[PDB]
Write a protein that binds this DNA or RNA. Sequence first.
RNA 1: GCUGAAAGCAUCUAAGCACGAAACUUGCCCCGAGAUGAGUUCUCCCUGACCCUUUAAGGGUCCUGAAGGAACGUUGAAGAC
RNA 2: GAUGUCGGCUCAUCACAUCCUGGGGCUGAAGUAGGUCCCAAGGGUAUGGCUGUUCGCCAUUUAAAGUGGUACGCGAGCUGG
RNA 3: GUGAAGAGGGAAACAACCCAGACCGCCAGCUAAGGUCCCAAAGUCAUGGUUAAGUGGGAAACGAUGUGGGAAGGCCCAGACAGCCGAGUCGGCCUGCGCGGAAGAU
Lengths: 38, 142, 59, 173, 208
Amino acid sequence: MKVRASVKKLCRNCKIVKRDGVIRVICSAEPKHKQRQG
Amino acid sequence: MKTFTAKPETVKRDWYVVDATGKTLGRLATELARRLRGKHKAEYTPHVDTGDYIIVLNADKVAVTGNKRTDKVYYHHTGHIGGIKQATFEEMIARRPERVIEIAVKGMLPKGPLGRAMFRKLKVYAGNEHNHAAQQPQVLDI
Amino acid sequence: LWIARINAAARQNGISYSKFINGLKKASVEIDRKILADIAVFDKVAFTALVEKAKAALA
Amino acid sequence: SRVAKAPVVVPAGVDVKINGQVITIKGKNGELTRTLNDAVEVKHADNTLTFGPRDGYADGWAQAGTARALLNSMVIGVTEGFTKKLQLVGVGYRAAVKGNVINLSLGFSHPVDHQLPAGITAECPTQTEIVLKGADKQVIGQVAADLRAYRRPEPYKGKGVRYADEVVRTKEA
Amino acid sequence: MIGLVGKKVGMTRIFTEDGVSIPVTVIEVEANRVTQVKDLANDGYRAIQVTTGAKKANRVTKPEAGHFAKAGVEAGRGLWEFRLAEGEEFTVGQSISVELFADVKKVDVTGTSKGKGFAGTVKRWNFRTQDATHGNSLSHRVPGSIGQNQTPGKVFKGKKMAGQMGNERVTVQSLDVVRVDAERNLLLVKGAVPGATGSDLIVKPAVK
RNA sequence: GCUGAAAGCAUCUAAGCACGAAACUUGCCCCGAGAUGAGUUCUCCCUGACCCUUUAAGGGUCCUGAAGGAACGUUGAAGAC
RNA sequence: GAUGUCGGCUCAUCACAUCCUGGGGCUGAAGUAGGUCCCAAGGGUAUGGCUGUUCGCCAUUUAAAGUGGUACGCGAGCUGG
RNA sequence: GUGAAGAGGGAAACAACCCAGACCGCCAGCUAAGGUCCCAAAGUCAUGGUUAAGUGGGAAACGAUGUGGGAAGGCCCAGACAGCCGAGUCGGCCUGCGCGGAAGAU
């Protein structure tokens, strides 16, 4: 998991979702692309 | 002449009964405090007590708005260094339902001996039954 | 003190203090708050009559 | 919206009962009951069910869509049913069934015993394969996930408990 | 489960055939007699009350005599109470003996500890002494500092200071039952228990 | 994580359901009804005549003195008193 | 027309930007052993040689020998290098 | 300009900020700044909108399919978008209110 203030898509398989008030990035191809805003 | 003043030895008081099911906490507390102080009688006098007795039923069924059922916090301190303690609205309703209405009403009454005496006329129950049939209370719809 | 007692008496007849004062001003009554409170405590039929006067003026 | 505007056919042999916001569906495979949101209206035309929003709520169409999907799943379940398949990969891994309990050996210092809930059935057509049968989609999915959580597939050889049709990526050191 | 009330006799040892010495405390447990049964409808909880011992007639007041005469038992030297668990029944006037512990393995013992009176911080709280030489001035067994400066400007509650020590209720948990002798009303347990020779003790089956 | 629309796909979440730590609330030990909101349960003791006055939770005289308590003495593995 | 200033001794109390023990995600994570980030303040957290030393170097231990505030905590509590 | 050498009302408390300049008495009336659910005097007043964060009731560069309004564009009943057949869908611009970034000692 990467925790930071600027979160964005890094490839074409990345997706942006909002869960319980937080902005997250989840990817189905690369586990290194998993991000959380905080 | 001189302005009229009430006398504690000759005031008249009455008994009422209220139901708290589905009501909003603060908007019920305002009415309770108003009638306990006695601001609805034309004989109101700031240094005398001229209120009524009120019974409240079904205290565990009072309502709140928004996300307050999990987000309102009650605090207190014990007197020992480090002794700060807290609870939530759900926890309070689970263990001591009557304190919820009691604290709200006590916050809206005057601070001092007369306010403490005004607080003594409130009777709060968590269920649907009371044992004051000898005083013959009348129904009050708020 | 006078104002508080007048509010209590008016709301038992079905009106608020502010509307009551407005109605008396429009009906051209010049009784002051001291006397109004005295009547509110010691004579209720007269106070009801005054409230009716104010309501008719406001209508 | 689009999902919620498609009605649900009620075939022969299935009984539909509606009471306020409670719906009961009965068929040869069993009985199911559910309570719906207070912003959805459901109607039973002649042999079809239709769903619509109620006036006064700001999210009627989404709730209608969810209710449609749920009712369709109920109707399929009370006639056909659902099944899931699990596979074991590793050395010395084994499974067995007795009554409504599954016994698993997965390389621990103690055996694993799992108790099935009410309405689910299990079978082991081999020492390295499990098949679950039921009539509730959510319950069957939850049981499969609970079974899989005891030993998840690992990334260097693939060992563990997996779904039958699941892709497991691997890498080297 | 329920327990019993006994008296402390003293300490001795038991020699085993393998060459081990076990230190034991001897407790005398006479018959406990039931004086009252409390239930839910009348009191709000479930318990029994017991007495034991003997008392001289010219020291029993009239209220106490009437209470004992309602039950039908001889007067004893005190009254005690025990809480009941589900599935337990008793009747007024019944006797209970030491054979209750015939199959128990571990017990808890409660009593009143010995008195030391007014005690200092070295004995009461394990404070360290200051120097005995090197220029100390009248400060050898004194406590030292008791706070900070202007912030907070007071002494906190719970501070550790000199005062009364001993003479209070203490409990010791999980002691082995070495012997139960019903012909002589004796219970032998392993280890030491609170109190002095001749004091009253309460014995219960272990909670942990 | 399961089921699932807004967004015919996908999505742990918006409606529903399941796990998850020495931190939180209990379970272990001690104090505790001055908790003025001063609580409950068992037992014991007291069953006489009159007068005055401003007439009331009024004042006084004679006869009676219970259950219990305190004081004194011999004292304690209880204690500065 | 006076609020005694460094270091040591005795006695402590709070924060969390976490030294050890507890729970997790990614790894250029095969296992053992590591790197980095997130959650968590219940409890625990060295003895000596040199020097007036706080620091610091050295010797030998420990799961670990945390960082800061409290008149750079504490002389109507002690010492006086 | 005010305090110094100036009282009264408001800003919780608060010389220097806002309103306003105390000769004495009254149990009369109207207003200023600021206010009208209870502590505490006076609208739980009326009509049309926005917020779901207790925002209101502390803070930036930067990041995001939160959601209200406005003017223009590309594709489409000669079949558009997504998935594997039948009405919409794409991406910029200007503007209102909210969300993260946000750790301290009785």
